[PDB]
Design a protein around this nucleic acid. Structure first.
Ligand SMILES: [Mg+2]
Length: 254
DNA sequence: CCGAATTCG
C-alpha cells in the first residue's frame, strides 16, 4: 500500500461461523490466509467466539481486535496496525434480541480521513423478520446521526430478504448499498449459497444476499470494486464458513 | 442457518 493507493479504503466483511466447532482451527487459518493475500485496512467479522480471537492473534497479528462482547458469540472489527488510528469503541444494544445481537461501532482515522465503521449480525431466520427490521432501523438511525464530517460505513450479516428492506422504509436518501451502487453485478450477488457451499450439509439449493455494505455520502465516497472471497475448499474438504466473504474497495474523494 | 413438516407448551 503506497502513495498511489492512499485515497482508498479496502475491507472484508465475513460471518466466519464460529458457532461451528468442527475443523474450526483450520477454518480460521483459511480466513487468515485470505487476509494475508489482500491485506485489507479493516475487517468486519461476525460469529467470532473467544477461541477464535486467539487464532486471529496468532495468524492475523498485524490487526488490532475490537469485539462486540466477551462471551458466547459476537462481532469484531479488525484494524490494520500502522494504517488505522483507533479513536473509540461504541456499542448500541438491541434490547429485544433473543440472540445477543448488537451494533458495534469503531471511530478511526485512515488515509487522512475520519470514519465511523459499523457492524452487526442482525437477528437470524425468516421467523424473526420483525425484530430484524427493528434492528435495521436502529442501524440506519445511527448512520444518520453521525457527524456530517465523518464517513460512515456499515458492513455486516444482515440476514435481510429484499422484501424486508421495502417494509422498513427503503434505504434513506443519503445511504447507499455498495452492490447496488456498482450496478448489481451477478458475480458477487449471493453471499450464502447451499448449492455451492456444503458446510451446513443442507440437502437443498437456496441462496441469499445476507451480507451487505451500506455507506453514507455527495460524491465523497465512491465504491470501486466488490468481489467474493472464501470460495476455496480447505484441506478438510470444507469451506472457511457457510458464508462467502465480501472484499470491497472504496475511494475517498475531495 | 433454507423451508416444509412436525411436535411442544
Ligand atoms: Mg451462522
Amino acid at each position: 500500500n503506497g502513495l498511489e493507493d492512499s485515497s482508498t479504503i479496502s475491507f472484508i466483511t465475513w460471518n466466519i461461523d464460529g458457532l461451528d466447532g468442527c475443523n474450526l482451527p483450520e477454518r480460521a487459518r483459511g480466513v487468515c490466509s485470505c487476509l494475508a493475500l489482500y491485506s485489507p485496512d479493516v475487517v468486519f467479522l461476525q460469529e467470532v467466539i473467544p477461541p477464535y480471537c486467539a487464532y486471529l492473534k496468532k495468524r492475523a497479528a498485524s490487526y488490532t481486535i475490537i469485539t462486540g462482547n466477551e462471551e458466547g458469540y459476537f462481532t469484531a472489527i479488525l484494524l490494520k496496525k500502522g494504517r488505522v488510528k483507533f479513536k473509540s469503541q461504541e456499542i448500541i444494544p438491541f434490547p429485544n434480541t433473543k440472540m445477543m445481537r448488537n451494533l458495534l461501532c469503531v471511530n478511526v482515522s485512515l488515509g487522512g480521513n475520519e470514519f465511523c465503521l459499523m457492524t452487526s449480525h442482525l437477528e437470524s431466520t425468516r421467523e424473526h423478520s420483525a425484530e430484524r427490521i427493528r434492528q435495521l432501523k436502529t442501524v440506519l438511525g445511527k448512520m444518520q446521526e453521525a457527524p456530517d464530517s465523518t464517513t460512515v460505513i456499515f458492513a455486516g450479516d444482515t440476514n435481510l430478504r429484499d422484501q424486508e428492506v421495502i417494509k422498513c422504509g427503503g434505504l434513506p436518501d443519503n445511504v447507499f448499498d455498495a452492490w447496488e451502487f456498482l450496478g448489481k453485478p451477478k458475480h458477487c450477488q449471493y453471499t450464502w449459497d447451499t448449492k455451492a457451499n456444503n458446510n451446513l450439509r443442507i440437502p437443498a439449493a437456496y441462496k441469499h444476499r445476507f451480507d451487505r455494505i451500506f455507506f453514507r455520502a455527495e460524491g465523497h465516497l465512491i465504491p470501486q470494486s466488490l468481489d467474493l472471497v472464501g470460495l476455496e475448499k480447505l484441506d478438510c474438504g470444507r469451506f472457511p464458513s457457510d458464508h462467502w466473504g465480501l472484499l470491497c474497495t472504496l475511494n475517498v474523494v475531495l
